[PDB]
Amino acid sequence: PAVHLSNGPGQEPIAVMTFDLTKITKTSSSFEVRTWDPEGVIFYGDTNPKDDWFMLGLRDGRPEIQLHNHWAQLTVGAGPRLDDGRWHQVEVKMEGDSVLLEVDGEEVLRLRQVSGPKRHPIMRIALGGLLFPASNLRLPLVPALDGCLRRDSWLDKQAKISASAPTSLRSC
Amino acid sequence: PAVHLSNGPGQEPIAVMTFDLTKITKTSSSFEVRTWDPEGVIFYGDTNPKDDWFMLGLRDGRPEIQLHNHWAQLTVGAGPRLDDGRWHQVEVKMEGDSVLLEVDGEEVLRLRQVSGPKRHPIMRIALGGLLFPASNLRLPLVPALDGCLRRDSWLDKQAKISASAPTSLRSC
Numbered sequence: 001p002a003v004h005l006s007n008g009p010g011q012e013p014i015a016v017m018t019f020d021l022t023k024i025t026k027t028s029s030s031f032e033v034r035t036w037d038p039e040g041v042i043f044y045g046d047t048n049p050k051d052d053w054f055m056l057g058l059r060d061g062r063p064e065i066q067l068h069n070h071w072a073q074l075t076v077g078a079g080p081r082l083d084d085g086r087w088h089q090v091e092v093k094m095e096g097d098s099v100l101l102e103v104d105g106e107e108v109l110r111l112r113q114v115s116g117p118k119r120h121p122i123m124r125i126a127l128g129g130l131l132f133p134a135s136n137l138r139l140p141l142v143p144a145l146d147g148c149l150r151r152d153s154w155l156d157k158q159a160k161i162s163a164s165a166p167t168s169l170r171s172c
Numbered sequence: 173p174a175v176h177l178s179n180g181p182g183q184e185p186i187a188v189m190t191f192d193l194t195k196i197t198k199t200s201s202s203f204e205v206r207t208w209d210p211e212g213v214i215f216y217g218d219t220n221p222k223d224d225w226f227m228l229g230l231r232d233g234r235p236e237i238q239l240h241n242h243w244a245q246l247t248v249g250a251g252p253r254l255d256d257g258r259w260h261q262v263e264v265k266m267e268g269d270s271v272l273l274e275v276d277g278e279e280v281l282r283l284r285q286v287s288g289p290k291r292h293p294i295m296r297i298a299l300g301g302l303l304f305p306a307s308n309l310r311l312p313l314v315p316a317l318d319g320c321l322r323r324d325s326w327l328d329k330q331a332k333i334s335a336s337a338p339t340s341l342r343s344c
């Protein structure tokens with residue numbers, strides 16, 4: 001059961017979820033993605049769109065992470081091209097103070113010393129788009145990602161406060 | 173013709189080279205490395221060991237870059253394990269404002285927005301060690317890298333001011 005990561009011309013995400021950070025024990029997300037599109041946003045996360053946000057996307061077909069928080073501000077590409085039309089497994093995990101990115105079962109990137117142990121305790125996760133204008137990225141891209149998403153798990157179901165309407169979704 | 177990246181117990185680099193930055197047109201370095209060692213420094217670069225330095229090393233067998241300058245400060249792992257005893261081609265290039273890392277002919281990491289266009293115009297490159305105590309790294313490691321280095325080219329020969337004695341080197 002797959003859903004489109006893009007719905008029409010607009011750049012708005014296809015879904016948003018909110019979580020209570022005081023109740024998250026599983027700090028990882030995993031999904032499968034398929035696309036012929038070399039550029040776009042896969043998902044976005046934040047507790048504050050000005051001071052504490054994260055983006056996983058594609059640029060030139062390869063994963064790109066942009067991160068801006070108290071401890072780190074970076075724009076990093078890594079891993080192989082994923083715009084080949086094959087399904088790819090992706091996992092993003094927080095391990096200690098590091099963010100790990102695994103692609104097709106292989107760790108391709110570890111951003112060390114990017115997270116601390118004060119913080120707004122509501123985390124939003126947006127799929128297929130950002131929760132601010134693309135102009136506010138560290139390095140702008142065009143967020144629309146013409147691809148499909150399946151087998152997707154986001155953080156801890158036990159900590160979810162809200163989830164956007166699922167009837168917005170468009171089957172693949 | 174290969175040389176050891178480690179010489180005895182000391183952590184000192186096996187070689188140091190200095191370059192005139194006003195005369196560097198080729199902002200890349202390339203070499204082959206072979207090792208069974210999961211941790212250590214491959215090479216170090218700086219114009220200032222306090223304010224503008226760079227380290228390429230291994231941690232848990234995989235490439236790690238530490239960088240500290242005016243524009244960026246980061247600790248990032250990427251790429252596959254290289255401590256398998258096979259020769260591996262490595263290239264580090266500055267492209268625009270980004271540092272690229274290629275391993276065995278594949279781009280594995282692109283640190284974007286990490287270099288500017290004021291700066292001390294002497295760059296040092298040290299092989300097999302740092303030019304400050306490992307304690308001053310963003311994330312300490314044990315610098316000794318029991319491996320061998322060959323087919324190595326460093327920046328622009330036309331810009332080199334000085335190079336350490338080559339009779340210090342130990343054949344592999």
Ligand SMILES: COc1cc(C[C@H]2COC[C@@H]2Cc2ccc(O)c(OC)c2)ccc1O
Pocket residue numbers: 021024026027028029045046047052053054067068069092093094099114115155
């Ligand atoms: C690395 O820094 C950030 C990463 C993110 C992105 C988050 C969503 O998928 C990766 C991350 C998971 C995660 C879950 C609970 C957390 O408490 C947490 O804390 C950082 C991180 C958002 C804001 C940041 O500051």
Ligand SMILES: COc1cc(C[C@H]2COC[C@@H]2Cc2ccc(O)c(OC)c2)ccc1O
Pocket residue numbers: 193196198199200201217218219224225226239240241264265266271286287327
């Ligand atoms: C990214 O930032 C740095 C990278 C480095 C490491 C340098 C040596 O191998 C990669 C780099 C090549 C290079 C050559 C000439 C340059 O003028 C230059 O400028 C940055 C960079 C040292 C200091 C930094 O600030």
Ligand SMILES: [Ca+2]
Pocket residue numbers: 037038039040142143144145146
């Ligand atoms: Ca696109």
Ligand SMILES: [Ca+2]
Pocket residue numbers: 209210211212314315316317318
């Ligand atoms: Ca070692």
